[PDB]
Structures are given as C-alpha cells and as structure tokens.
C-alpha cells in the first residue's frame, strides 16, 4: 500500500525482520507473493510446504516465486492442513514475519471452508451443511430460490444452475466441497479395474496423485503436468484408484484413440469393458462402464442422432465416479463448459500440460473443476532426467529491405503473410534444417500460415502436413519420418499442436507463429520434451528454435509468446547471426528470387 520514491512498495514499517534471518530462507509479501531460496539447505522442505499452500508463478533456478490465493488455501485444507498447521510453520519459515493482512487472509480462507458441502445422490444435488446458520444467511439473494428446483440440513438444487451457483458461492465466502467418498459409496458398485505392476509411477506422479488423494475421499481438481511427463499415466492411475465408473473426455479423434491405448496398456481392465463414444466408431457405449468420449459430441448443440441420443440419455441418467478431462485449458469455452453440467460426476479430475490462455477464463477453472492440485516443476524434471533438456533459442532473422517497405507501407494485415515469408528466415530455416539434417537430428517444422507452409515445403520439397490432408497420407508421412532414414523432417501445420502422438524429435523449428498464444508455444514445445533412452540433462540434446523477424510485429508476439516458458525457467537465447550461413549456399541468394516471392505474396490477396 505504501510506495517508495521508486515503483516498489515500501514495507519498512509494515513487518519486522527475524534476527536469525539467514537461517530462514522464506519471504512473505503482504500481497501474498512469496520468494523462496533454491540454494538454502532446507529448500526441499520449504518447496513441499509452499507448493501445498501456494501455486507457482515463476520458478527460476535461484529464487522461486509463489503467490497464494483463496483457491490455493482451500486445497491445503482439503489435504488436512489447518490454519494453525500452515500459519505456524509459515511464521517459523518466514525470515521477516507474517504481515497481519496475510494472517487474517489465511484465517478467513481456512475457516470459510467445509461449511457448505455439495453432494449428488440419486441424480440429485443436495447442498449439505452441518451448520444450519450458513444456509439461513445464504438465502438472502433471490438467485438461490429461483436456482433451487421448484442438523446436516441439505436441499436439492437444479442441475443446470450448478455452475452459476458454484461461482456465486466462491465470492460469497463459502466454497463448496466436491470430495468424493469413493471408499464409502454403495449406490454405485465399484468397477473391476486394477493397476498392473508393469506401470511405473514416477516420484512427481505419486506426489501429484498424493495431493489429489489428501484423504480417503478423492478431491476434484486440476493437475498440470508436461505432456512428455506421462500425464496420461497419472489419469489412468486416478481412475484405477477410484475403482468407480470413469468418463474420460478427449478433445479430438487422436485424443480418444490414445486414451484407450493408455487404459489397456496400464490397466488390467478388459478390452470389452472400454468403449469409444465416438461418431466415427463406437463399441456399444451403454454396454460397458469405462468410456472415452469428446467434448464436441457430449456438448453437441444441434440435432442429435438417434443412436447418439440414446447414449447421451444413458450418460445423463447414470452417475460417474470420476470425470477425467484432459486438456482442461479448453473447458471454459462456451460449448465445452456446458458438458460439465450435462454429465454428473462426483469428482472431475483435470489433466493438461499448458494451463494458460489470454482471456481471463482460466480462473473459472478453479470453480468449474477445482483448485489446481499439482503443477510439476519443469526445471526439476529436467535435472531428474524425466524430461529432455531443451536449449531454447530465438533466432533473429533480419527482414529483407524490399519486404519491409511494403510491410511498413501497408497499414492492412497482409503483414502476417509477409513477415512470416521473408528470404532471410527462409535461408535461416533452410540453413538451420541443413545443419541439423547432417547431424542426424529429427526436425519438426511448424507454421500457422498454410500458404507459407506450402511454399516453404515445395521449395524444400518436404512432406508438409495440414488440416485437409488425408488421414491415410497423414499416417504414411509420419511412418516414413519415424522409420525412413532418408527423411528426417516433417512440416506440420497448426494441427500438430492440437493433439498427436509423434515420435521424439531432437529439434523443433517454428518459422511462423499463430500469435501471442502461450498455449500454442507450450503445446508445440512439449513435442521435443520426450526423454530419450539414454540421454543426459546437460547434453542439451533437444533444441527449440522460434524464428522471428526483426523490427516487425512478430517480435511483439514472440516476447509475449514466451512468458509462460520463462516462468518455468527456460532461458530463451537470442541469435543475431548464424555462423556458416554465408559460406553455405541457400535459396534466395539473389535479388530476383526475392522479387518473385514478393510478387506472389502480393498476388496472394
């Protein structure tokens, strides 16, 4: 609240300093931001404690950055951490005390939890609460009565209005409890699903699962994990532990296919007990319990097919023990978020790898599903070898003179097709691919602009893939890339970042970018994170290039596009010039060649 002569807020008169400050490696700002030391001998103990109560926002190598909020604190109580259980240790760990504002905030957040509990039974949602006083003063707003369908006091609530009420209670200072007591539940018989000994659970995976299962009752929340970290395995394990009906929801045809393979590979459950509620193909969804479906079909808004209609009615009627939603970052979408209310589930676990977006709808994920249970440390995984180390880089490609003139001259937005297609980046990518091609490194180019992607591919006569590409040709190209030594590069369009199972690649060039989308960058980055059989963290075998054009709008997006990655700890190095580019022969080595491309670019319209 107090501002120094500079921008920083003043806290000299706010909180004191512990005499043994050096022993205590923890800081506590009044705003809730916390700065831990990654060099302290007791760093690990602090890391576990802070992660339990706070959600990371920046975890560079030396000094991590944690901020706590109401959602973060509620999760701590769910795992059994009381206000004194956390504040006492926080004061002990704090090297500068705890400001009263945080103290009262912690007290208010912890006490305002568990008073209101939401339980669904017999397809009816009852807002149970041991304390009756909470309900008495909770019915002041008229929305509650109209929302409601027309000790331990409970009342049934309308199915459709659950989401509206859930967000209302969050700002009402009375969060709802979504814990599932699968251990004590006889209404829905347990499913015959078991985890085979073959599956191996990594220490972070166990910790993420442990945080989800704070007590005998499973907690509904979001577990963010890298795609190469094996987030699919964790989802399977959670379903196996619940031992009740689970409805995994994908986002595309590829997503549903992989999940079924993951279930069979890691779960002993029989093949016949798994169904694919997919329009393209089905396996008698009503017949068995464990099902894999997609947001589009379940949330499909237009006319429903007769066969789908029966399945949809069957899904609505039944009650699901678990509702795994992979790629939760798309949930707050209008159609996608409707699926939450359409189906009934006790705890709706959420998995993903890039929990970031521009529109401030990510915060809704806290109430749409639950608090962010776990968010693995990408840097720590790199040290442990679970994830391939990446030498993130940003190759600056100076714009050719003529190209800039039209780019600056025109105030229209043809520039997206212009600065994405310039000779220097073309030579840069052409040179960059050539260097990696002779190094036996697998390349995965990317480009939002299909027009640029096709032009780059034909000139480099490489197997470019994109949306309307035939499925058969899509598989044929991938198989050659994985197997054929003669080919070690595939030019994938945006479809690559959506969902796929691609072979591990040593490098990932990105000539163009869709825009300032932290999702796409992290989505595309996860492709090379696939750990190799016998690599090492320090070898930096995996690389990532995000080619950009200097003095162009592309730079603004690139800096705005790397915010999420740097927060994890990745350092994006800049490369003004590439050694050996001049000696190596490359296309567009003469003014005429650039002129024809510019004319074609201008003729694009």
């Amino acid at each position: 609240t107090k501002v120094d002569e500079y921008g920083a807020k003043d806290y000299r008169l706010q909180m004191p300093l512990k005499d043994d400050h050096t022993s205590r490696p923890l800081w506590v700002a009044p705003d809730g931001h916390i700065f831990l030391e990654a060099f302290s001998p007791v760093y690990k103990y602090a890391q576990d404690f802070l992660v339990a109560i706070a959600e990371p926002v920046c975890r560079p190598t030396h000094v991590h950055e944690y901020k706590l909020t109401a959602y973060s604190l509620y999760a701590a109580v769910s795992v059994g951490l009381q206000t004194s259980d956390i504040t006492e240790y926080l004061r002990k760990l704090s090297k500068t005390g705890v400001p009263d504002g945080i103290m009262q905030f912690i007290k208010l957040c912890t006490v305002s939890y568990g008073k209101v509990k939401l339980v669904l039974k017999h397809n009816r949602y009852f807002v149970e609460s041991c304390h009756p006083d909470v309900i008495q003063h909770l019915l002041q707003d008229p929305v509650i009565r109209e929302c409601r369908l027309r000790q331990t006091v409970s009342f049934e609530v309308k199915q459709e209005m659950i989401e509206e009420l859930q967000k209302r209670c969050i700002h009402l200072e009375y969060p709802l409890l979504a814990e599932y007591d699968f251990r004590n539940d006889s209404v829905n018989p347990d499913i015959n699903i078991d985890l085979k000994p073959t599956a191996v659970l990594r220490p972070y995976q166990e910790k993420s699962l442990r945080k989800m299962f704070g007590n005998g009752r499973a907690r509904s929340g979001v577990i963010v994990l890298p795609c190469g970290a094996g987030k699919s395995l964790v989802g399977v394990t959670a379903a196996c532990t619940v031992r009740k009906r689970c409805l995994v929801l994908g986002n595309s045809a590829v997503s549903v296919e992989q999940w079924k393979a993951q279930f069979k590979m890691w779960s002993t459950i029989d093949d016949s007990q798994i169904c694919r509620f997919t329009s393209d193909a089905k396996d008698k969804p009503i017949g068995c319990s464990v099902a894999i479906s997609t947001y589009s079909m379940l949330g499909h808004t237009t006319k429903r097919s007769w066969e789908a209609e029966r399945v949809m009615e069957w899904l609505k009627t039944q009650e699901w023990g678990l509702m795994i939603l992979d790629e939760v970052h798309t949930i707050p979408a209008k159609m996608f978020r409707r699926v939450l209310t359409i189906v009934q589930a006790h705890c709706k676990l959420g998995l993903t790898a890039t929990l970031v977006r521009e529109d401030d709808k990510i915060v809704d994920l806290n109430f749409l599903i639950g608090p962010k249970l776990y968010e693995a440390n990408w840097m720590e995984l790199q040290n442990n070898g679970y994830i391939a180390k990446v030498q993130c880089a940003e190759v600056w490609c100076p714009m050719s003179p003529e190209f800039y003139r039209e780019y600056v001259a025109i105030k229209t937005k043809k520039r997206i097709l212009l600065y994405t297609m310039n000779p220097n980046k073309f030579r840069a990518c052409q040179f960059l691919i050539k260097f990696h091609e002779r190094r036996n490194d697998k390349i995965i180019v990317f480009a939002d602009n299909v027009f640029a992607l096709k032009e780059y591919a034909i000139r480099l006569n490489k197997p470019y893939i994109y949306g309307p590409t035939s499925q058969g040709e899509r598989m044929q190209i991938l198989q050659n890339f994985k197997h054929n030594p003669k080919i070690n590069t595939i030019f994938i369009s945006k479809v690559g970042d959506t969902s796929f199972d691609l072979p591990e690649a040593n490098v990932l060039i990105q000539i163009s970018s869709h825009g300032g989308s932290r999702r796409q960058e992290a989505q595309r980055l996860g492709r090379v994170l696939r750990a190799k059989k016998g690599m090492v963290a320090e070898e930096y075998n995996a690389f990532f290039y995000s080619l950009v054009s200097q003095d162009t709008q592309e730079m603004a997006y690139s800096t705005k596009r790397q915010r999420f990655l740097v927060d994890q700890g990745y350092s994006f190095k800049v490369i003004t010039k590439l050694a050996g580019m001049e000696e190596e022969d490359l296309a567009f080595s003469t003014k005429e060649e650039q002129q024809q491309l510019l004319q074609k670019v201008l003729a694009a319209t």
């Binding site: 100076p398 800039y404 200097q550 003095d551 162009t552 603004a556």
Partner: protein
Amino acid sequence: NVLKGVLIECDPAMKQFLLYLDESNALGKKFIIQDIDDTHVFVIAELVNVLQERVGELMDQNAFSL
C-alpha cells in the same frame, strides 16, 4: 552542388522505413535529400530530432511492454 544537412547510417530495414516516411510525407516533407547508399541517406539537420522520435515510436510497436 553543396547541400547542408546530416547523414544517417542504419541497417537496410530501417533505410526502407525512412524511404517510406519521405515518400508518404509522414513528417510533411521529403527530408531525404539523397540516398548515399543502401545503408546511408541524407536528411536535414533540423528534422533529425523529430525523425529519431518517430523511430523510437516504431520500436515500441515491435517490442512487448514487459
């Protein structure tokens, strides 16, 4: 002939921007007296300060405000 002014050298990308400025009369005058080279141009001394300001505005567009 002899012409007064100042000579400014920059990368070819910027040189094109200056050519756009004079051609489009962004500053209202064809300050570019002559093009010495692909990376060199000549401008009137009085208009250097305002021209440098415009380039500073250009950098803001191609740089995110962290």
